[PDB]
Each structure stands twice: as structure tokens, then as C-alpha cells.
Amino acid sequence: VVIVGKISFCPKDVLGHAEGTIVYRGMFDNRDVAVKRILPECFSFADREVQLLRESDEHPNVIRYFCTEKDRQFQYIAIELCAATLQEYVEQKDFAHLGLEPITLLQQTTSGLAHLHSLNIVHRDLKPHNILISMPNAHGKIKAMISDFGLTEGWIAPEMLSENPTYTVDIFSAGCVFYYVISEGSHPFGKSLQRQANILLGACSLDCLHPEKHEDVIARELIEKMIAMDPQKRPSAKHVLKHPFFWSLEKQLQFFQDVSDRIEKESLDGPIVKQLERGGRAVVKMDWRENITVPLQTDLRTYKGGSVRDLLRAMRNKKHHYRELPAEVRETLGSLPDDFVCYFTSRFPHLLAHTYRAMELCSHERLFQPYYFH
Amino acid sequence: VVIVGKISFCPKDVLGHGAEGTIVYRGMFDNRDVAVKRILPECFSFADREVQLLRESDEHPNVIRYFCTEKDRQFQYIAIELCAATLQEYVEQFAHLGLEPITLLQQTTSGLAHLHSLNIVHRDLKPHNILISMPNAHGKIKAMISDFGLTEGWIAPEMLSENPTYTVDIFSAGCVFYYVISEGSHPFGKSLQRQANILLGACSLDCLHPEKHEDVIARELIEKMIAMDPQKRPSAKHVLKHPFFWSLEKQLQFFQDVSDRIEKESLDGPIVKQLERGGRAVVKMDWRENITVPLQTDLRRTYKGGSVRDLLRAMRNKKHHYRELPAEVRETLGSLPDDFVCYFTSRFPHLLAHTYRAMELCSHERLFQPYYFH
Ligand SMILES: CCOC(=O)Nc1cccc2c(Oc3ncccc3-c3ccnc(N[C@H]4CCCNC4)n3)c(C)ccc12
Ligand SMILES: CCOC(=O)Nc1cccc2c(Oc3ncccc3-c3ccnc(N[C@H]4CCCNC4)n3)c(C)ccc12
């Protein structure tokens, strides 16, 4: 049992290991902490590390930093003790029973990154090993926190290999982490020792994302942009956070309703509706009236099966008049909003992604403020 | 400058005092600015309980951040986040900080709800221990509660009449709400008079005008928070749902959802009867005569001037069809959502409060979950 000022730890309890650094399970001011021990050859950089932690850890998805002490031969840095790294969480068995929502972990990670970027801090080394997963709080909630910021490979943006990086390098890394999480351990650029060369070669695939499943279509749309070889094509963190990938089912339904309201009095020859119907036959599966349940078919009469506009209108109509619908129709649709919107997105996997892209024409309008990034 | 382990301070920099002869200095901890409370040996037992509460409670953004405690031969020291002001200072001396009072109160109440969710009762909530943070890197200032679980004028009457329940804090908070929005008054009077008036149940909310929307709404809530009967006071989570805290956009969304809900309601049903009970006063005898002529014109027709239900339907109609309204009509209303809703609440100060009470009948319905506490 080693005591160094306010920091203590039993060197028996080792949590991990670069440059002779060791991380221990420990204690600070009667808090559980992880304690990183730094060798004298690194003290200058540690003081840089510690300064960054102080300006940054007033965001819930940035790791909380408590204290640093220094004896004759070492410097110790104490941070919040966590349950796991994201790498452990994705790869180790049993964490699956924590039942964490992968999208929420990713939202949290990206909120922490956005915070860092708002402070003119570039992470430079984001990867699952330094995304930490908290101990559960009093209400059983577990969160992701970023660490090891501002300081083998496989997560490095290709332009950083090809002297002061910009924020888009972190967006590339985050894109790979996103895929890693929702695919439960794959990586767009392949197997561990292969990834960084494939990055340099632009050799990726997102094959775990199915082309006709709504959730996968939406995830792909976002991830392909985040890992683009051209950094100027990558969205900012705040921009990522606005993507439909992160929308609740209620917000997705609300988007469909607003879109439908917006184009109710729009000319069928106007730019908006034409944009919406471009490639629409594929979106509605040729005739959407033939790819809905019989009870809904019956309850549906000026609607064209070949029109995306009309599908949206039908959706808004049944939502708006839900209470007065027959019991059989309410049953086939499911309850509002969650089951209702899945009735449609499960049957038309391209509808939300298609409609989101088409309605960028209106992204500057106050109404659509919640949906797009300005 | 005095040094005690990780905590340092210059004894000149005094921030305040306290019971038992405690002193609070401006100091430093691990290169962070902190307030440093110095405690005497004749209190160390209470301090260790203080510190323990701080350790379990300070994860929440609206609970004071606690950093460290040190002890020498003579004293004990507690370091917390250094703040800009107490709410007492803020209210009584800052206005160019441009802080929103409702937002400060919302933050104060979120902090309290956190403590209550941990089975902690504050017992001594008052403006002096609500702290106002220094501006962060993005200029944001927040309220944080302190001095929890440890003359007067803020004590609930049943506490001076064993182990207090959470409702005593709601009484204290109700008084604080009125103090902030009134810029220094108290429902039970002047400083030396308050606690006797509390015992006697003698309060008034005279700063709240009976024909101003914002005050009607504030009164509705505050009267309940400071009820003499503790069982009549809402919980902190319940407080946080009140219209007092709603954005203008949310206020308008409530009106729209209500109008949608009652569109196919019979006038024989309880919802519409509840909405029309006492409605003459809400619509000022005839609402058609209390709106601007451009709007009078455009509502001709089939709207009943004596009907709350119809006024709400009117508001919903013009909102939904806003884009397609004459410019002179879009002009008198103002833009969606903020100016539009104010057009109506400014003219009908009782509409939201009335409609909110009447529609409690539907508070269990999924649609109205945003608006009521379950
Ligand atoms: C400018 C930013 O600088 C930093 O953030 N510096 C750091 C200081 C101290 C620990 C760090 C750190 O922690 C760890 N580093 C290596 C191995 C494990 C942990 C760690 C941290 C917190 N909790 C835990 N818990 C273990 C429990 C057992 C299962 N695995 C997680 N581990 C990581 C990563 C990354 C950075 C750390
Ligand atoms: C279980 C909870 O126990 C606690 O929270 N214990 C506390 C420890 C240390 C300071 C405390 C504390 O701080 C102060 N107590 C008296 C006077 C000033 C401050 C204080 C604290 C932080 N910042 C500031 N800033 C000053 C700057 C000058 C203008 N006034 C505010 N003051 C208050 C209240 C209340 C409680 C405090």
C-alpha cells in the first residue's frame, strides 16, 4: 500500500500500461480513482496533460480529473475510476448485460468531443481504448467519457500520416468508432494490424450495414461522411450530433409530420416536391399501397402509390386522425409515436434518409432548425 | 500565503464567515481557483459529514463541485469551486450579466431534485447558499446549491411546530422563486418578520399582477410551493414540469396539441365542459373583440367569440396555415413561434393557466406527457 500525499493505491491493483507508465486502482480524498504513474522522463508532458484536464473536465462526457501528486521519483495523476474502456465493453463478454444503448454511448462520446473542439482542443488520438465507460450512478446510469486528448494504430486520419491538425482528424476517428460500436467490433478499414495501411490506401467497407434496413441506411449515410478521405467533406462534431442517427422515434415521426405539413400547399412542379420525388419510386417500393398491411390498405382515397409525397401525407393523416381510426387500423399501426413510425420505416427503409436529403432545400427555415445544422 | 497540503490561500482574501466561527477564503487547489472553508476542531465531526455529502452529491451540474479537504494540527479545510456570487448578492446588487431568472430557478430546482433523488433533504435552502458560477469559456453562468444536509425566514412552518421530508425544501424554494422574480421581496414579508408570518400563515404575492400572463403563471406555481399544508406542495420533479419553465415555442405547442385533442370532442363531454367553465372571463366576454382587425377580418368564419375552445381552434388554424396568410395578417400576429404565441397570451393573460388546469383531465394521455407530471 503506497501513499503519496492525498493519492493512495495498492500496487497489487494494476489497471494497465507507454514509456514506463502504469495505471493503478487507487484512492483520493476517499473517492475511488484510477492512478496513472509517470516516469521523470515525461514530467513536462504530464503537466501539459494535467492542464488540459483542468480546462476540460467540466463536461459530463469528458473524464473527471481530481488531483496530481509527485514524490521523489514519480508523478501521479488521479482520475475518476471507471467500469471499462469502450474496447473492453465491445470485445469482452458479459458487459452486454449492462444493456447500454450503443447510440447513446456514441452520442455521449461525440458530445464530449464537441466540447473539446469548442475549446480549440483537438483530440488527435480518439479510439475505443481511451473512451471510458463510467461506473453506474445511484440511478443505474452509465456514460461514456473521453480521455487521453490533446496529447499500433488503426484510427488515424490518412492526412495526419500523409504540423498542427484540425478538428476533422477526430471526426475520421469517431466515424471508425461509430462503426466499431454498432457492428460490435468490426472496423471500416479491416482487422487490427491491417487498418492503418488500408486507411492510407482508402480501402474500406461498411458491410455490416445492411442496404435495406432503415437503421443501417441512416448509420451508413452518416459514417461514410465521417470517414471520408477528403477532410473537408467531414462534418463537424455539432453537425454529427444533429444527424437522424441520433433522433428518437418521436423526433423521426415529428420530422415526417413537419415535412408533410411544409409541402401540403407546394406545387407538384416546384423544386421541393420534384426533389422529393426524384428516385422516389424505389423509395415507395413502386407502389407503397401494396407494401402496407391489409387493414391500412382498406382504410385508404386520392393518394398515389407511386408518390413519396402521398406516402408522407398518408402518414400525417393517420397520425392526425389516430383517435378516430378503426380499432383494426390502430392495431396494425401500433401506438403513437414509437410503434407508428416503425410501421413505416420498417417497411420503407429508405424513406427517412431519402426525405432528409431531399428537404435540405428547406434547412434554413425556422421550422426545420431542429433537424439540420446551420 | 498559507499552505496546507494541496490547498493554499492568502489569509487576506476573506469571502465570508459562518456559525461556530468558520471562515471562508479565496484560495487554490491543484492550480484551480477555489473557496476554502476553515473549520475548527470543535466542528470536525460535522465537517466530515459535510464532506461526505459533497462526495456523493456533486456530480450534478447544479450542485456545487467539491475538490478536496486537508487537515493540520489546528484546523480542517474544505475546498469547493470558486463562484461569482451568492444568489442573495445577485438579487440585491449584476443585472447586466443578463441572466434569465427563470433559468436560474430551473437550475436551482434541478439541483434540488438531484438531492431529493438521493434521499437528501437540504433543510436550509435560501439565497445565501445558492451559488452563481463564474462564466465558463462560453460565457455561461449557472446556479448551484450548497450547504445541504447540515435570523431565518426561509423555514417551512411544520419544521418549527424529527426527520424532515422533502416538502420542507419545496416551501423554501417557493419563497426563493418569488424572491428572484420579484427582485428582492419575500412572500412572508421583510427579513425580521418572515418567520413569524410563516408560522401565522401570513403571506402575499403582491408583486404578481393578476392580469399579466407571466405573473398569473408564476403565481399558480408559487402558491402551491409555499402551501401551509406540506402534502399540497409539489415535488421538485413536479415543479420542473410547470408552464412557468416552458419556452414560448413549448407554450404554443401545448395550445396546438390541446386544440388538436379537442377538435372532435363533443360539447357534452367533460373536457370541453371543463375548458368552457369560467371561459367568459378567459376570453374577455368576446375574444373576437380583443384581437386586431386584420385577424378579425381573416376569421370570417363560424367561430364562437364566447368559446375558449374556438379561440384555441382559431390559434391552431392560423398557426398551421401561417405561410398562406395575407401579409397584413402575418404582420399583426408576428413570426412563429415566439411572437405568434405572445400575440395571444399578452391579450388573454389567463388562457394558458386556465387551459393548463382544464386539460389536466388528459394528463395521463401520451400526447400530454411533455406537459404534466406523472
Ligand atoms: C489530457 C488527458 O489526459 C488523461 O486523460 N490522462 C489520463 C490519466 C489517468 C488515467 C488515464 C486513463 O486511464 C486508464 N488507462 C489505462 C488503463 C486503464 C485506465 C482506467 C481509467 C479509469 N478507470 C479504469 N477502470 C478499469 C477497471 C477495470 C477494467 N478496465 C477499466 N481504467 C486513460 C485510459 C487515458 C488517460 C488517462
Ligand atoms: C454539504 C454541503 O456543504 C457545503 O456546501 N459546504 C461549504 C464548503 C465551502 C464553502 C461553502 C460556501 O461558500 C461560501 N460561504 C460563505 C461565503 C462565501 C462562500 C463562497 C463559495 C464559493 N464561491 C464564493 N465566491 C464569492 C466571491 C466574492 C463574492 N461572493 C461570492 N463564495 C457556502 C455558501 C455554503 C457551503 C459551503
Numbering used by the authors:
A (entry chain A): 563 to 579, 581 to 714, 734 to 744, 749 to 886, 890 to 963
B (entry chain B): 563 to 655, 658 to 714, 734 to 744, 749 to 887, 890 to 963
Article sentences:
The lumenal domain senses unfolded proteins in the ER through indirect and direct mechanisms: as a result, it undergoes dimerization and subsequent oligomerization. The association of the lumenal domain promotes dimerization and oligomerization of the cytoplasmic kinase-RNase tandem domain. The cytoplasmic domain has been shown to self-associate via different surface contacts, where a back-to-back (B2B) configuration is believed to fulfill the essential structural requirements for RNase activation.
We determined the crystal structures of G-9807 and G-1749 in complex with IRE1-0P at about 2 Å resolution. By occupying this front pocket, the tail spares the K599-E612 salt bridge and does not insult the C-helix, perhaps explaining why G-1749 activates the RNase instead of inhibiting it. In fact, it seems that the creation of the front pocket by G-1749 selects for an upward loop conformation, as observed in F2F IRE1 dimer structures. The co-crystal structure of G-1749 with IRE1 revealed a B2B dimer, with no major conformational changes in the RNase domain or in dimer symmetry, but showing a completely different conformation of the kinase activation loop.
